[PDB]
């Protein structure tokens, strides 16, 4: 099996603005989880072949990592801050569905979901 294409980057067709929030997301929320120790496996997307996983995308049908998240934020791919809230959501929870309770990728991605939700405690204000 090979992997599937990444996820959608870009895209000209979907009107595009600048928030605080957005600008917060990208400044401080991504850039502490991306330089943290356990960032790595999350930096992109979850290569199946590589890894020889072949049952990762029989279940993972919405796939989403951090290198995604920067380039959609650097693309101005979200009209709102929730849009990405949901992007880091939605890659724990992949993490936790294929993933042991307990098993080390879990923990790695229990200490960035930490980071995150403090992070994302102090969103600022809206527009
Ligand atoms: C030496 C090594 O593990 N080099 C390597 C290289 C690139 C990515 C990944 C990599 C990428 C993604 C993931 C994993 C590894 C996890 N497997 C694993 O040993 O994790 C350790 C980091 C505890 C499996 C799982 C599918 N996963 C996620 C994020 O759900 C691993």
Same mark, same amino acid.
């Given at each position: 099996s090979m992997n599937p294409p990444p996820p959608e980057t870009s895209n000209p067709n979907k009107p595009k603005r600048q928030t605080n929030q957005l600008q917060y997301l990208l400044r401080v929320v991504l850039k502490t989880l991306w330089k943290h120790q356990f960032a790595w496996p999350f930096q992109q997307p979850v290569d199946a072949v590589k890894l020889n996983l072949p049952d990762y995308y029989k279940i993972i049908k919405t796939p989403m990592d951090m290198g995604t998240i920067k380039k959609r934020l650097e693309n101005n791919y979200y009209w709102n801050a929730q849009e990405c809230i949901q992007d880091?959501?939605? #890659?724990?929870?992949?993490?936790?569905?294929?993933?042991?309770?307990?098993?080390?990728?879990?923990? #790695?991605?229990?200490?960035?979901?930490?980071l995150f939700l403090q992070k994302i405690n102090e969103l600022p204000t809206e527009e």
């Open positions: 880091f959501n939605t #890659m724990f929870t992949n993490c936790y569905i294929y993933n042991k309770p307990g098993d080390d990728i879990v923990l #790695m991605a229990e200490a960035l979901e930490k």
